[PDB]
Amino acid sequence: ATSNPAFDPKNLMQSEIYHFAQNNPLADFSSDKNSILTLSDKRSIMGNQSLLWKWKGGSSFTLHKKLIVPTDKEASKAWGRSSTPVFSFWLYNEKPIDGYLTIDFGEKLISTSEAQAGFKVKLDFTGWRAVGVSLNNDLENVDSIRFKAPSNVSQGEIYIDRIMFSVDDARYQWSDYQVKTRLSEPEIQFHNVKPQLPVTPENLAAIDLIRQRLINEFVGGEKETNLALEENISKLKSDFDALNIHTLANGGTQGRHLITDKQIIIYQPENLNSQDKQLFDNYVILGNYTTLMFNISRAYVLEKDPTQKAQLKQMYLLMTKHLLDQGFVKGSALVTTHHWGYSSRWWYISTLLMSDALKEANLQTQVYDSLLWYSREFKSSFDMKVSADSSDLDYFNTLSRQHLALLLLEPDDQKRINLVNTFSHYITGALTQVPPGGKDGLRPDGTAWRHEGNYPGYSFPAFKNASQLIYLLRDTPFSVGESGWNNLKKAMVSAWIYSNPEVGLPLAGRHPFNSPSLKSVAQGYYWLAMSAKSSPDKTLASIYLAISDKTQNESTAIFGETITPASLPQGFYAFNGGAFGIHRWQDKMVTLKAYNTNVWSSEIYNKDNRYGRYQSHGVAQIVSNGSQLSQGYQQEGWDWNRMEGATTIHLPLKDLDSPKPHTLMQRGERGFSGTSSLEGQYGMMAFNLIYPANLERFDPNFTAKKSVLAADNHLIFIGSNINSSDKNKNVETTLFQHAITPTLNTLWINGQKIENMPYQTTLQQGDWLIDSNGNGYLITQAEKVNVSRQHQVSAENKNRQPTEGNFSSAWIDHSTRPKDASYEYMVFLDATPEKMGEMAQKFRENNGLYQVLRKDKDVHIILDKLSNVTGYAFYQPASIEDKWIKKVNKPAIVMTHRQKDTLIVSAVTPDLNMTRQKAATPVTINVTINGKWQSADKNSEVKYQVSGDNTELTFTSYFGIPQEIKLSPLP
Ligand code: NA
């Protein structure tokens, strides 16, 4: 504390703290009214001493301190976010008091004064509590702060420490059992499903087995993310001693004060005076503390030496006693505990391991009640009523096992069984339902959403823990419903398909060049495989082996059965939940990605993905199995304009940077864009590139139509109707871009090996290249293709700091055609100089590779002569002239393959037919085909009707999921 008023203009943000570790400690204090004020050193919050206040009923002491209390506006201006001046302190009762403390604020207050405003603190409790109120908002209708003991209590005794005037976040003074504020987080009210399971030996055993299975996971290796594991006992003893915790003879502890990472905000640490900051730095951060608690519990469970095991128990129990005495108990807000999980997640888990110890020490009820109370922050999930928001992917990551741990700690058997039964139902619903609109959760095409779109960086950690939850509960009366198992399998098989083993650049969300990897989800495949109704699920088992690099020989001891590791999946898979598709051939995967009204192009934050504008610009990133960095996808020097496959305007980075300083998730201008599939082997992307009417830095007249047809070892790319405001100046389509290294050092051009750096040349129709990753590019329609091996300067995506690197790249320059520019080229995924010569020759023979049957604003039609498949991107409903397709009445992607005796036709719209609020509903598409056909089976849901000379097909497109039918000719 200082001589200046609280909230003083030299530093309004500098807190005034009465911590008594300075001279004239009680100078500003006058006991007066029937009170005696002493300092004690057996107990304290900040420093080593606290104020001991002995009193008789209705008596008072006074803090003499001028306050120039700022308005919420003044406070908020001073800090930079919505704020309020707050008065706070800590108090300790050694026994409960049947009355209220009255704290009053006024001018020259003595006991006879009435004067102004104040508040009430209920004293019916024991141990430390914190009190914190907004001076502007929390008082019942200044240089005097008067603390008045209860009028209706004969006598008593209170300890008080760390009296503080500070500027605080206006959201975070919470009500509790001692003080009422304007803010309240309501307590959990558990849902309960009927009928109830009975307490029986079987049901009780199953509960205890679930607890044991959880213990197993947390002690038996498997590295948890965001757990600072420490197994060396000596280190644990060392950190524990440094806590300086001692039991006090008559109840309570003394030791270092515990504070959460969010609680510290009330002090305004960075603005504390030096005397205060030094005393504040001897606080212990709760997160580190509960991590220590967990690490000790794990060590205790594993400890072979009975003496060492008993030491570990004692350390844990004492940590527990200190924690509760510090005021982390039921009904104690501690002013706030928001983001509670970051400070306590491993406390919940530690109680599983220490369940028996807590019981014998008679601490289980107190710990349960405390954890339950602080969990009220998570009431929307912890209540366990299934709602539109229950499929929250972050919950599965950060809270789901903690929620289960809490339930298992409930003391009553019948209630514990009710809770875990309800939890089983909650998880089954969460993993089964299709959330409406853009709400989190799994989707019917296998995508999995957070931040309102498919997002691997969030889904991957959720798949790991949701699979683990199902495995924890397996083969008991609490097992997750098969519907939830099925939906999660669809999503995890899908993730296997769209990762290699990292997801592509187009799926990297706001972390380009730091994609999530299926390697982090590996154990989830084992857990889900082993929790099948008929375990093991061979598919998921085979995937686990592949991802974890385990052999068939190793499979028997893991799964109880010999299983061949999955080979890399082959063919084409449409995922319109992200307006993408994946083509796979041999060890390569191609991520084809568009965007539209329902799929944001990119997620860009204040400090993430700043240059991500073209992340979804009809990209087609090719990735061979293995590290993408090893393949030359290097952030340093990367030209963010030149994302592989995209048509873009090449811009200076200052212009390419998102025009919003904080968040932009730019959605497209129509519902239609994405992909479709045929026979699980062939695919087509259709991408209608349209920009907003008036978004700064976005050219409103930038347009393109871009389609890709993928089959076997090749892809055919075509583009039409390319335009901009400036006659296609700087308009480019990128064939490829990758870093140059000793292993990636060659480019083939037209049978010639190029290694020089720098190197430039220009190519045209009939020319070919092979990049260092073995992809062949044959230029089939373009006037001007630039090829460059050059030093490039760029900036990294978080803080825009300069980077550099050497790159090989090639792009089509569309500026040769001022209006409705166009391109065609073809990629071969297994290219060699030899095979490319063969392809170029085939091209020169009246184009034996493919034929473009239509290339306009309404339809793109590509016949692939290598695979004998035709793809039809109806950007608009149209009647057409064609051998197979006559008319389609909605924007759609249609595909055909005439095999020996059949015609297979697939259709979809990649338009999900939804909004951010509304559930997707099915789109009915009528596809008229030429000629008379009948159905070459009966297992297929597409409807058909001969009508005159032609056949009417009726497709139902739900969530952009393709359907197909095998047809045979009618005589
Ligand atoms: Na103190």
UniProtKB/Swiss-Prot annotation:
Site note Transition state stabilizer, residues: 510
Impact noted for substituting residue 662 to A: Still active on both chondroitin 6-sulfate and dermatan sulfate, but with reduced catalytic efficiency
Keyword match Lyase: yes
Enzyme Commission number: 4.2.2.20
UniProt cross-references to CDD domains, sorted A to Z: GAG_Lyase
Molecular function terms, GO-annotated: carbohydrate binding; chondroitin-sulfate-ABC endolyase activity; metal ion binding
Domain of life (superkingdom): Bacteria
Result when mutating residue 451 to A/K/R: Loss of activity on both chondroitin 6-sulfate and dermatan sulfate
Compartment annotation: Periplasm
InterPro entries reported for this sequence: Chondroitin_ABC_lyase (IPR039174), Chondroitin_lyas (IPR008929), Chondroitinase_ABC_I (IPR024200), Gal_mutarotase_sf_dom (IPR011013), Galactose-bd-like_sf (IPR008979), GH-type_carb-bd (IPR014718), Lyase_8-like_C (IPR011071), Lyase_8_C (IPR004103)
Keyword Translocase attributed: no
Gene Ontology CC: extracellular region; periplasmic space
Keywords: Calcium, Carbohydrate metabolism, Lyase, Metal-binding, Periplasm, Signal, Sodium
Binding-site residues, Na(+): 19, 46, 49, 161
Active-site residues, Swiss-Prot/TrEMBL: 451, 458
Main location: periplasm
Temperature-related activity annotation: Optimum temperature is 37 degrees Celsius.
Record annotation: effect of changing residue 603 to Q: Still active on both chondroitin 6-sulfate and dermatan sulfate, but with reduced catalytic efficiency
Documented activity regulation: Is inhibited by Zn(2+), Ni(2+), Fe(2+) and Cu(2+).
Subunit (UniProt): Monomer.
Protein name per Swiss-Prot or TrEMBL: Chondroitin sulfate ABC endolyase
Species of the source: Proteus vulgaris
